[PDB]
Amino acid sequence: MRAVNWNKKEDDFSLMFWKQNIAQFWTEEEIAVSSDKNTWVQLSKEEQIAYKRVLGGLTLGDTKQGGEGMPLVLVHLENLQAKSVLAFMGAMEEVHAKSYSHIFTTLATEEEIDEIFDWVDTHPLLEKKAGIITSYYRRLLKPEVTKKELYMAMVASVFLESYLFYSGFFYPLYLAGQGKLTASGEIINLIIRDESIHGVFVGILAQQIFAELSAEDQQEVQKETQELLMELYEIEMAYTEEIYTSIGLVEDVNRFVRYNANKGLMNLGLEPKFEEEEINPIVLNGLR
C-alpha cells in the first residue's frame, strides 16, 4: 500500500496548487463585518431579502462541496499528491460555508437567520439544483467506480463552483462595487479567490481522466456534459427570475451566469457556449 511521496512528482501541477492553496489560507475571524451595518440599513427590505437568500444558497453549495463533492472525488483518485490538494480544498469549503454564518451574525437576528436556513432547506429550485449535482457525487458511493462516473462528478464539481454559484456571488459583488457591504465583500472575494483555483485544478484532473477514456466513453460524457450544462442553465434562469425580479437585476445576473459558465467550460478544456460579453462594470469594481 502506497504512501504519498512528495520527493517524487506524480504530475507537473499538484505541488504548485498545494503551495498556492496553503498560501491563500484564511479564516472568517480575519475580517470584521460590523462596519457593514451602516450600509446594510440603507438597503431596502427587498434588497436585504435578496442578499440573505443568495448567501443562503451559497452556504448550501459549500456545505455540499466540502461534505460530499470533494471527499467522494478525492477518495477515488489514484494520484496521492492530487488527493492531498483536494483534501485541503475540501477543508476550505468548510471555511467558506462558515464565513457566511459570520456575515449573518452581524446582519440578521437569530429568528431571521433561522428563517433563511428554513427557506434554503425547503426551496424547490435549490433542492433541484443541489439534487442534480449531488446525484453525480452519490454515484461514487461504491467500492469501484468507472472513470466515466468519476469524470462526470468532476464536471459537476466544476459546474457547481465555476458556474452555478455565480448567480449568487453576483449580488455581494454588485453591492460591494457600489460601496455597500464592503467588509462582507472582502470575504466573498477571498472565497472567489479560492474557487478560481479550485475550478482550474479540478478541471485539470477532469481533462486527465477524459484522455484516459475509450472513444465510446468519451463520446458519452461529452454529450452528457453539454446536456448537464444546459439543464443547469435552465434551472438557474428560473432561480434568477425568482430571486432578482423584485430588485430589477434578472438580465444582469443572467449575463454574469453565462460569463462564468464559459469560464467553467474553459476549465474543462471545452469551448465557450455563450456569447462572450464583458463583465458588468459594477461587479468588476466589486472584485477590485
> Binders of Mn ion among 141-170, rule CB under 5 A?
161
Is 72 one of the binding residues for its own copies (CB under 8 A)? yes
Is 238 one of the binding residues for its own copies (CB under 8 A)? no
Residue 94 interaction partner, one of its own copies, Mn ion, none, beta carbon < 5-8 Å per kind:
its own copies
Grid coordinates representing 205 are: 484532473
* Shortest Å distance, C-beta 161 to Mn ion: 4
Quick check: 280 and 256 in contact, CB under 8 A? yes
Is 22 one of the binding residues for its own copies (CB under 8 A)? yes
Nearest CB to its own copies, comparing residues 18 and 274: 18
Residue 195 interaction partner, one of Mn ion, its own copies, none, beta carbon < 5-8 Å per kind:
Mn ion
* Shortest Å distance, C-beta 57 to its own copies: 8
Residue 137 known to be catalytic: no
Grid coordinates representing 187 are: 470575504
Nearest CB to Mn ion, comparing residues 94 and 220: 94
> Binders of Mn ion among 9-68, rule CB under 5 A?
62
Is 60 one of the binding residues for its own copies (CB under 8 A)? yes
Is 275 one of the binding residues for its own copies (CB under 8 A)? no
Tell me the C-alpha distance between 69 and 90, whole Å: 8
* Shortest Å distance, C-beta 226 to its own copies: 25
Among 32, 75, 230, 284, binds its own copies (CB under 8 A): 75
Amino acid in position 259: Y
The catalytic site residues sit at 100
